[PDB]
Amino acid sequence: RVVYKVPEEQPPNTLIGSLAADYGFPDVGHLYKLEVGAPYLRVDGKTGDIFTTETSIDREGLRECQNQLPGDPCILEFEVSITDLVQNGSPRLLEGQIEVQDINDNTPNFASPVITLAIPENTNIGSLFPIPLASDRDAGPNGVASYELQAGPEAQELFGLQVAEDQEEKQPQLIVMGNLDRERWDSYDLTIKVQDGGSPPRASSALLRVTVLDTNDNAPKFERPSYEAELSENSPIGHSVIQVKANDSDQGANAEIEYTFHQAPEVVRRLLRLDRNTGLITVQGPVDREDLSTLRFSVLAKDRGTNPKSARAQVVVTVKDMNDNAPTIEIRGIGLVTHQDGMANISEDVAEETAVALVQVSDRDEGENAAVTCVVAGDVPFQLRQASETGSDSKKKYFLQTTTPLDYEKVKDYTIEIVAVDSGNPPLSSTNSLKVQVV
Amino acid sequence: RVVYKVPEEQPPNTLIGSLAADYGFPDVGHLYKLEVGAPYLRVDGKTGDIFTTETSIDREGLRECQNQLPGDPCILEFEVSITDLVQNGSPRLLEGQIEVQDINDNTPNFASPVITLAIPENTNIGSLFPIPLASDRDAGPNGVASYELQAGPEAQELFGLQVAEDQEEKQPQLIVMGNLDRERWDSYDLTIKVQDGGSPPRASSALLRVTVLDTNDNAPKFERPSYEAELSENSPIGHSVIQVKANDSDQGANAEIEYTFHQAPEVVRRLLRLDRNTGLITVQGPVDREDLSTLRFSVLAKDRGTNPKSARAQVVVTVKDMNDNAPTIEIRGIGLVTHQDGMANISEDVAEETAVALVQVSDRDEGENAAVTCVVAGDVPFQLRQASETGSDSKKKYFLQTTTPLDYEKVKDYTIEIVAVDSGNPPLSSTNSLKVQVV
Ligand SMILES: *[C@@H]1O[C@H](CO)[C@@H](O[C@@H]2O[C@H](CO)[C@@H](O[C@@H]3O[C@H](CO)[C@@H](O)[C@H](O)[C@@H]3O)[C@H](O)[C@H]2NC(C)=O)[C@H](O)[C@H]1NC(C)=O
Ligand SMILES: *[C@@H]1O[C@H](CO)[C@@H](O[C@@H]2O[C@H](CO)[C@@H](O[C@@H]3O[C@H](CO)[C@@H](O)[C@H](O)[C@@H]3O)[C@H](O)[C@H]2NC(C)=O)[C@H](O)[C@H]1NC(C)=O
Ligand SMILES: *[C@@H]1O[C@H](CO)[C@@H](O)[C@H](O)[C@H]1NC(C)=O
Ligand SMILES: *[C@@H]1O[C@H](CO)[C@@H](O)[C@H](O)[C@H]1NC(C)=O
Ligand SMILES: [Ca+2]
Ligand SMILES: [Ca+2]
Ligand SMILES: [Ca+2]
Ligand SMILES: [Ca+2]
Ligand SMILES: [Ca+2]
Ligand SMILES: [Ca+2]
Ligand SMILES: [Ca+2]
Ligand SMILES: [Ca+2]
Ligand SMILES: [Ca+2]
Ligand SMILES: [Ca+2]
Ligand SMILES: [Ca+2]
Ligand SMILES: [Ca+2]
Ligand SMILES: [Ca+2]
Ligand SMILES: [Ca+2]
Ligand SMILES: [Ca+2]
Ligand SMILES: [Ca+2]
Ligand SMILES: [Ca+2]
Ligand SMILES: [Ca+2]
Ligand SMILES: [Ca+2]
Ligand SMILES: [Ca+2]
């Protein structure tokens, strides 16, 4: 009817207590038989002495106390029946109770010998991150008592050990104490150590890995800020113009880049295609220099981050000239010489070095492809003389003057064909006529 | 019945000849009427004098002599009838003939005031190239007599004027006297001048253009002889590896280049694609560094000439490592400790710092992705000690030794789980077990 406090895991045949403190007398005509708790306990039979056995009483692994709360003790009950050896025929039944005293026979440890914590790279100082707890099958001071953060020099002054001391359970926590930057270090090796509070203390150690996640904190940047390239007029579709490239220090989709035309006039969009993945600018239209000599635009690199960061680069492509236009001869009336549908009305009186018509010839190409030379065909008395001076210009003009004295009778009409050709390869030629009619 | 030689284009009423040399007498009872050649000739009627008219006799443009050969003269016949004025009733019929003497009234000229000759750029010295002839409506010395080649300084000492003097006709010819090279000059401006042989002489001048055709005499050349590039393991299909570029000084199809793998092992062909037109090498397979750390090959640029000229360029791509392989834990028997299906048979006698098994852990990645750390899980009396020294190698090995004194009774069997993790981002972990059974 009284309780007996006993340590667990005692050695066999350890005296727990004597019922001498109870009502019976020592070895006095009473048989002490045990009826309950047979596996663990054992009685002297003659005396009221209780003893242990070779089946060690284990607080941690005994049914009676498995799902228990911290405050409650581990109890196992027993029933010792005493029968008077004087043949009196009425056994007494003494109910008894054992409170198992705990002892530090279990080590605290973590579910896994390694722990992986994931911390965004620009988390503000003071941020907390929980660590998986260590469990101790023991109770009281023999349970989890204190953690400790063992880290290297670099890791020190970045991470600290703060512990929520909530009566529920020890909550360990990693406090961020410095700025992280995945583009500098993306892995840290901490070591966490746990101990229990009974002496001598038990301990465990798990490796705490801290990897840092990527934030889109870096925008893309182009190899060089601006791009130059040349491209031949009338190039074949698919011909490669230039390749633009930018790279981003981030990781994953925060560094995956896509290229797109930024503020490109329609005229350029029609003629150029920009492969968004490879950043390759190729031709997709008729590159005609005479329409546009040089095309300018800016390309945009955008990383695939949720809040994507941009980057701009200027690019200019100069179009190299091709000889795809022939010279053009125009004939018009100089001074008082009216022209109409390619005809002229002249008298045979003013006949020497007299300008009849003014011819201007011009070629839309560049340089040697517009270096035009012009002459008069056949045998007709009309010289082409240098009209005026534009320097060394590609377009020139000539006085179409007379070289002979004319007479209405012998010569009646004319048909003059002027021929022009450019110094190209292949060369291009044009011809234009003029029927000077005399009166 | 006699012939009369007369120049053409005479002035009207020019005395050609008198029939006084014939049988009749001057103005003696004979009427001289003209019956043939009315348009051009005219007779005095009283005398036997023949005269011209205002319809000028033209050798060049008269029907009687159009399709004639050089030797033949221009003839026109006439019939003068004489009737005796003494009423004798039997007219005599005098047949006569005029040979038109030629005079230099026509200028030699070319069909076109400009002539375009096409000369391959590496034609050997001495090669001949015909020039269109000049035509002269005149005949004899009044016809084409001599050409002349008027050229600039640069053109001089490259081209000469040689003339086939075949009795058929003057054949002008341009003789090549120096090496041409379209990659140096692709256009030349000669001037050809023709004259006739009657004095004063007539002349014409046509511009003779000489353009040079392209021969595939230049092979392509790469921007730089060799190419380096980096490429991340397991890159997405289509990702741009590098762009190779070569250019050729020729023109047209002799400079159009196509790029193809030259002597590339199949392993590289499976993983890389080379766009033959743009020369862009992109990814088309699983880039696995552990299979090949760096891929080397050579690319070929071939111009589209009929006899195409080649160009080779070496290229090496180093594969950047990714953490796509987890560490591997192997457990094997050290010394006299036989292992079988992950078991061991040990006695509790040798118990302190006694190697039970040998563990070797290794990661196929590189650097931090193979920087492995290894530990023992849970609470079990077995320490991992540094087995031996490979320096700072990525693969390590540990003695799996005992840390406590064992006894067959209290401890009966074990299950040890070794855990390994690499210093990657993300990190990869592996685990391997070993059931050491005691006897
Ligand atoms: C994004 O692109 C830029 C520009 O290409 C990269 O920066 C460049 O990286 C190369 C490779 O290391 C550097 O080459 C270095 O050159 C110096 C001499 O200039 C030499 O001493 C080194 O041994 C090395 O060969 C280059 O200097 C550097 N340029 C700049 C302006 O930074 C950048 O690395 C790329 N991004 C990533 C994530 O790789
Ligand atoms: C085929 O590609 C080669 C290599 O890119 C071209 O040769 C290069 O042409 C550029 C453009 O003129 C040259 O730039 C020059 O640089 C010098 C200083 O190095 C500067 O003083 C000049 O004003 C000019 O900017 C470059 O030097 C030259 N490199 C070599 C090795 O020749 C070549 O032109 C291309 N083929 C064709 C037909 O264009
Ligand atoms: C020349 O005069 C005729 C006569 O009326 C006229 O029809 C023609 O248009 C004139 N041409 C020029 C160029 O003056
Ligand atoms: C241990 O001994 C048992 C007994 O036969 C045997 O079956 C087993 O294979 C042995 N294992 C080792 C690792 O020696
Ligand atoms: Ca216990
Ligand atoms: Ca404990
Ligand atoms: Ca305990
Ligand atoms: Ca950062
Ligand atoms: Ca980042
Ligand atoms: Ca980014
Ligand atoms: Ca054009
Ligand atoms: Ca052009
Ligand atoms: Ca032109
Ligand atoms: Ca007149
Ligand atoms: Ca004539
Ligand atoms: Ca002539
Ligand atoms: Ca003549
Ligand atoms: Ca050449
Ligand atoms: Ca060539
Ligand atoms: Ca070529
Ligand atoms: Ca791989
Ligand atoms: Ca790898
Ligand atoms: Ca790895
Ligand atoms: Ca023993």
mmCIF file of N, CA, C and O in Angstrom, chain B residues 267-323:
data_model
loop_
_atom_site.group_PDB
_atom_site.id
_atom_site.type_symbol
_atom_site.label_atom_id
_atom_site.label_comp_id
_atom_site.label_asym_id
_atom_site.label_seq_id
_atom_site.Cartn_x
_atom_site.Cartn_y
_atom_site.Cartn_z
ATOM 1 N N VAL B 267 31.139 10.597 -81.372
ATOM 2 C CA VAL B 267 30.694 11.069 -80.065
ATOM 3 C C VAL B 267 30.397 12.561 -80.116
ATOM 4 O O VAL B 267 29.452 13.044 -79.480
ATOM 5 N N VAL B 268 31.190 13.314 -80.881
ATOM 6 C CA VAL B 268 30.977 14.753 -80.989
ATOM 7 C C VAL B 268 29.829 15.060 -81.942
ATOM 8 O O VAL B 268 29.037 15.978 -81.702
ATOM 9 N N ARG B 269 29.720 14.304 -83.037
ATOM 10 C CA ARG B 269 28.651 14.550 -83.998
ATOM 11 C C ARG B 269 27.284 14.342 -83.360
ATOM 12 O O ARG B 269 26.330 15.065 -83.670
ATOM 13 N N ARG B 270 27.169 13.358 -82.464
ATOM 14 C CA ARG B 270 25.889 13.099 -81.815
ATOM 15 C C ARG B 270 25.456 14.268 -80.940
ATOM 16 O O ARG B 270 24.255 14.521 -80.794
ATOM 17 N N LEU B 271 26.411 14.995 -80.361
ATOM 18 C CA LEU B 271 26.098 16.016 -79.370
ATOM 19 C C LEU B 271 26.063 17.429 -79.934
ATOM 20 O O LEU B 271 25.438 18.304 -79.324
ATOM 21 N N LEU B 272 26.701 17.679 -81.074
ATOM 22 C CA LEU B 272 26.779 19.018 -81.640
ATOM 23 C C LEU B 272 26.237 19.034 -83.060
ATOM 24 O O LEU B 272 26.417 18.076 -83.819
ATOM 25 N N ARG B 273 25.573 20.132 -83.407
ATOM 26 C CA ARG B 273 25.128 20.384 -84.768
ATOM 27 C C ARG B 273 25.789 21.653 -85.283
ATOM 28 O O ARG B 273 25.891 22.652 -84.562
ATOM 29 N N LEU B 274 26.226 21.605 -86.538
ATOM 30 C CA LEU B 274 26.883 22.726 -87.199
ATOM 31 C C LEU B 274 26.011 23.165 -88.367
ATOM 32 O O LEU B 274 25.893 22.445 -89.365
ATOM 33 N N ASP B 275 25.397 24.339 -88.242
ATOM 34 C CA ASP B 275 24.593 24.893 -89.326
ATOM 35 C C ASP B 275 25.519 25.289 -90.468
ATOM 36 O O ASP B 275 26.341 26.200 -90.323
ATOM 37 N N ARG B 276 25.383 24.609 -91.609
ATOM 38 C CA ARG B 276 26.365 24.750 -92.680
ATOM 39 C C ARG B 276 26.380 26.159 -93.261
ATOM 40 O O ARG B 276 27.421 26.611 -93.752
ATOM 41 N N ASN B 277 25.251 26.865 -93.222
ATOM 42 C CA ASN B 277 25.197 28.199 -93.811
ATOM 43 C C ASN B 277 25.717 29.255 -92.843
ATOM 44 O O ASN B 277 26.608 30.039 -93.190
ATOM 45 N N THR B 278 25.180 29.288 -91.623
ATOM 46 C CA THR B 278 25.564 30.308 -90.654
ATOM 47 C C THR B 278 26.825 29.952 -89.881
ATOM 48 O O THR B 278 27.366 30.817 -89.183
ATOM 49 N N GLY B 279 27.307 28.717 -89.986
ATOM 50 C CA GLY B 279 28.477 28.313 -89.231
ATOM 51 C C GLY B 279 28.274 28.310 -87.735
ATOM 52 O O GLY B 279 29.245 28.445 -86.986
ATOM 53 N N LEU B 280 27.035 28.156 -87.276
ATOM 54 C CA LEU B 280 26.716 28.200 -85.856
ATOM 55 C C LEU B 280 26.687 26.782 -85.297
ATOM 56 O O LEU B 280 25.865 25.959 -85.715
ATOM 57 N N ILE B 281 27.582 26.510 -84.355
ATOM 58 C CA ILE B 281 27.634 25.237 -83.647
ATOM 59 C C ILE B 281 26.778 25.346 -82.391
ATOM 60 O O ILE B 281 27.097 26.119 -81.474
ATOM 61 N N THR B 282 25.705 24.555 -82.351
ATOM 62 C CA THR B 282 24.767 24.485 -81.239
ATOM 63 C C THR B 282 24.693 23.053 -80.716
ATOM 64 O O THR B 282 25.268 22.121 -81.290
ATOM 65 N N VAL B 283 23.943 22.884 -79.628
ATOM 66 C CA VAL B 283 23.844 21.610 -78.925
ATOM 67 C C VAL B 283 22.658 20.824 -79.459
ATOM 68 O O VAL B 283 21.584 21.382 -79.713
ATOM 69 N N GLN B 284 22.852 19.510 -79.623
ATOM 70 C CA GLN B 284 21.772 18.632 -80.058
ATOM 71 C C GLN B 284 21.773 17.305 -79.303
ATOM 72 O O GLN B 284 21.243 16.312 -79.816
ATOM 73 N N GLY B 285 22.348 17.259 -78.104
ATOM 74 C CA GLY B 285 22.392 16.038 -77.334
ATOM 75 C C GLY B 285 22.735 16.271 -75.876
ATOM 76 O O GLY B 285 22.917 17.407 -75.426
ATOM 77 N N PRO B 286 22.826 15.186 -75.104
ATOM 78 C CA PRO B 286 23.139 15.297 -73.672
ATOM 79 C C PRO B 286 24.624 15.532 -73.445
ATOM 80 O O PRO B 286 25.446 14.626 -73.617
ATOM 81 N N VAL B 287 24.972 16.755 -73.048
ATOM 82 C CA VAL B 287 26.360 17.114 -72.758
ATOM 83 C C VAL B 287 26.654 16.649 -71.334
ATOM 84 O O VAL B 287 26.279 17.309 -70.364
ATOM 85 N N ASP B 288 27.328 15.509 -71.209
ATOM 86 C CA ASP B 288 27.644 14.894 -69.922
ATOM 87 C C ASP B 288 29.156 14.954 -69.735
ATOM 88 O O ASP B 288 29.901 14.268 -70.441
ATOM 89 N N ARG B 289 29.607 15.778 -68.785
ATOM 90 C CA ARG B 289 31.042 15.937 -68.570
ATOM 91 C C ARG B 289 31.695 14.614 -68.194
ATOM 92 O O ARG B 289 32.806 14.312 -68.644
ATOM 93 N N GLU B 290 31.029 13.816 -67.357
ATOM 94 C CA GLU B 290 31.636 12.571 -66.900
ATOM 95 C C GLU B 290 31.892 11.616 -68.057
ATOM 96 O O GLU B 290 32.778 10.759 -67.968
ATOM 97 N N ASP B 291 31.133 11.744 -69.146
ATOM 98 C CA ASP B 291 31.422 10.968 -70.347
ATOM 99 C C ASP B 291 32.625 11.543 -71.089
ATOM 100 O O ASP B 291 33.567 10.813 -71.419
ATOM 101 N N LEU B 292 32.614 12.850 -71.351
ATOM 102 C CA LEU B 292 33.732 13.535 -71.993
ATOM 103 C C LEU B 292 33.920 14.890 -71.332
ATOM 104 O O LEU B 292 32.992 15.704 -71.311
ATOM 105 N N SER B 293 35.121 15.132 -70.804
ATOM 106 C CA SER B 293 35.391 16.396 -70.127
ATOM 107 C C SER B 293 35.485 17.544 -71.122
ATOM 108 O O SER B 293 34.933 18.625 -70.887
ATOM 109 N N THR B 294 36.190 17.332 -72.230
ATOM 110 C CA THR B 294 36.389 18.358 -73.243
ATOM 111 C C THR B 294 36.356 17.690 -74.607
ATOM 112 O O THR B 294 37.000 16.655 -74.802
ATOM 113 N N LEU B 295 35.607 18.270 -75.540
ATOM 114 C CA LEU B 295 35.471 17.720 -76.884
ATOM 115 C C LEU B 295 36.270 18.564 -77.866
ATOM 116 O O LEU B 295 36.129 19.792 -77.898
ATOM 117 N N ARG B 296 37.096 17.894 -78.666
ATOM 118 C CA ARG B 296 37.948 18.530 -79.659
ATOM 119 C C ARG B 296 37.532 18.070 -81.047
ATOM 120 O O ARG B 296 37.154 16.909 -81.236
ATOM 121 N N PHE B 297 37.605 18.973 -82.017
ATOM 122 C CA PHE B 297 37.309 18.604 -83.399
ATOM 123 C C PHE B 297 37.791 19.731 -84.301
ATOM 124 O O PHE B 297 38.279 20.762 -83.830
ATOM 125 N N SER B 298 37.664 19.517 -85.607
ATOM 126 C CA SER B 298 38.064 20.495 -86.606
ATOM 127 C C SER B 298 36.917 20.711 -87.578
ATOM 128 O O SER B 298 36.271 19.754 -88.017
ATOM 129 N N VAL B 299 36.667 21.972 -87.906
ATOM 130 C CA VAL B 299 35.603 22.345 -88.825
ATOM 131 C C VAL B 299 36.224 22.737 -90.157
ATOM 132 O O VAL B 299 37.360 23.228 -90.224
ATOM 133 N N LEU B 300 35.455 22.522 -91.222
ATOM 134 C CA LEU B 300 35.886 22.757 -92.592
ATOM 135 C C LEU B 300 35.006 23.817 -93.232
ATOM 136 O O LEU B 300 33.775 23.724 -93.180
ATOM 137 N N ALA B 301 35.646 24.810 -93.840
ATOM 138 C CA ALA B 301 34.982 25.808 -94.667
ATOM 139 C C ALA B 301 35.310 25.506 -96.122
ATOM 140 O O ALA B 301 36.488 25.408 -96.489
ATOM 141 N N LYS B 302 34.271 25.346 -96.940
ATOM 142 C CA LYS B 302 34.420 25.041 -98.358
ATOM 143 C C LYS B 302 33.659 26.085 -99.157
ATOM 144 O O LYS B 302 32.457 26.271 -98.945
ATOM 145 N N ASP B 303 34.348 26.764 -100.069
ATOM 146 C CA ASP B 303 33.653 27.674 -100.963
ATOM 147 C C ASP B 303 32.928 26.883 -102.050
ATOM 148 O O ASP B 303 33.265 25.734 -102.349
ATOM 149 N N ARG B 304 31.908 27.510 -102.639
ATOM 150 C CA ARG B 304 31.040 26.841 -103.601
ATOM 151 C C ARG B 304 31.569 26.920 -105.030
ATOM 152 O O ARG B 304 30.781 26.858 -105.982
ATOM 153 N N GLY B 305 32.881 27.053 -105.208
ATOM 154 C CA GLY B 305 33.449 26.991 -106.539
ATOM 155 C C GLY B 305 33.408 25.585 -107.104
ATOM 156 O O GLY B 305 33.375 24.593 -106.376
ATOM 157 N N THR B 306 33.403 25.504 -108.435
ATOM 158 C CA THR B 306 33.324 24.201 -109.089
ATOM 159 C C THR B 306 34.451 23.282 -108.628
ATOM 160 O O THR B 306 34.218 22.104 -108.335
ATOM 161 N N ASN B 307 35.677 23.801 -108.557
ATOM 162 C CA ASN B 307 36.781 23.095 -107.919
ATOM 163 C C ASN B 307 36.990 23.727 -106.551
ATOM 164 O O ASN B 307 37.822 24.630 -106.403
ATOM 165 N N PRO B 308 36.263 23.282 -105.530
ATOM 166 C CA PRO B 308 36.173 24.075 -104.302
ATOM 167 C C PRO B 308 37.451 23.998 -103.485
ATOM 168 O O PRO B 308 38.093 22.949 -103.392
ATOM 169 N N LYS B 309 37.811 25.129 -102.890
ATOM 170 C CA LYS B 309 39.001 25.236 -102.063
ATOM 171 C C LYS B 309 38.614 25.182 -100.591
ATOM 172 O O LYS B 309 37.614 25.775 -100.175
ATOM 173 N N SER B 310 39.411 24.465 -99.810
ATOM 174 C CA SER B 310 39.064 24.126 -98.441
ATOM 175 C C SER B 310 39.783 25.036 -97.451
ATOM 176 O O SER B 310 40.672 25.815 -97.805
ATOM 177 N N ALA B 311 39.370 24.932 -96.189
ATOM 178 C CA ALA B 311 40.075 25.577 -95.088
ATOM 179 C C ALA B 311 39.679 24.876 -93.799
ATOM 180 O O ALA B 311 38.495 24.608 -93.583
ATOM 181 N N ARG B 312 40.659 24.581 -92.949
ATOM 182 C CA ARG B 312 40.432 23.825 -91.726
ATOM 183 C C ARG B 312 40.700 24.699 -90.509
ATOM 184 O O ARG B 312 41.596 25.550 -90.530
ATOM 185 N N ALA B 313 39.919 24.488 -89.449
ATOM 186 C CA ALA B 313 40.127 25.207 -88.198
ATOM 187 C C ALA B 313 39.885 24.275 -87.023
ATOM 188 O O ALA B 313 38.865 23.582 -86.978
ATOM 189 N N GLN B 314 40.817 24.268 -86.075
ATOM 190 C CA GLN B 314 40.658 23.477 -84.865
ATOM 191 C C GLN B 314 39.769 24.209 -83.867
ATOM 192 O O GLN B 314 39.774 25.440 -83.781
ATOM 193 N N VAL B 315 39.002 23.436 -83.108
ATOM 194 C CA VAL B 315 38.137 23.986 -82.071
ATOM 195 C C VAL B 315 38.067 22.993 -80.922
ATOM 196 O O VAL B 315 37.948 21.779 -81.131
ATOM 197 N N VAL B 316 38.140 23.527 -79.704
ATOM 198 C CA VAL B 316 38.036 22.746 -78.479
ATOM 199 C C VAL B 316 36.981 23.394 -77.596
ATOM 200 O O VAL B 316 36.989 24.615 -77.404
ATOM 201 N N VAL B 317 36.070 22.585 -77.070
ATOM 202 C CA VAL B 317 35.070 23.052 -76.121
ATOM 203 C C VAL B 317 35.285 22.296 -74.822
ATOM 204 O O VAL B 317 35.216 21.061 -74.798
ATOM 205 N N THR B 318 35.555 23.031 -73.749
ATOM 206 C CA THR B 318 35.657 22.441 -72.424
ATOM 207 C C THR B 318 34.279 22.453 -71.780
ATOM 208 O O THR B 318 33.564 23.458 -71.847
ATOM 209 N N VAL B 319 33.908 21.336 -71.168
ATOM 210 C CA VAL B 319 32.583 21.176 -70.582
ATOM 211 C C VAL B 319 32.661 21.554 -69.110
ATOM 212 O O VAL B 319 33.388 20.923 -68.336
ATOM 213 N N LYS B 320 31.915 22.586 -68.724
ATOM 214 C CA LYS B 320 31.851 22.980 -67.324
ATOM 215 C C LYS B 320 31.020 21.973 -66.540
ATOM 216 O O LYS B 320 29.997 21.477 -67.021
ATOM 217 N N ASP B 321 31.466 21.673 -65.324
ATOM 218 C CA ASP B 321 30.868 20.599 -64.547
ATOM 219 C C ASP B 321 29.586 21.056 -63.865
ATOM 220 O O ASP B 321 29.445 22.213 -63.457
ATOM 221 N N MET B 322 28.645 20.124 -63.750
ATOM 222 C CA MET B 322 27.428 20.315 -62.979
ATOM 223 C C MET B 322 27.311 19.181 -61.972
ATOM 224 O O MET B 322 27.875 18.099 -62.156
ATOM 225 N N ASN B 323 26.572 19.441 -60.895
ATOM 226 C CA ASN B 323 26.412 18.461 -59.821
ATOM 227 C C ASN B 323 25.244 17.532 -60.155
ATOM 228 O O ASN B 323 24.165 17.586 -59.564
#
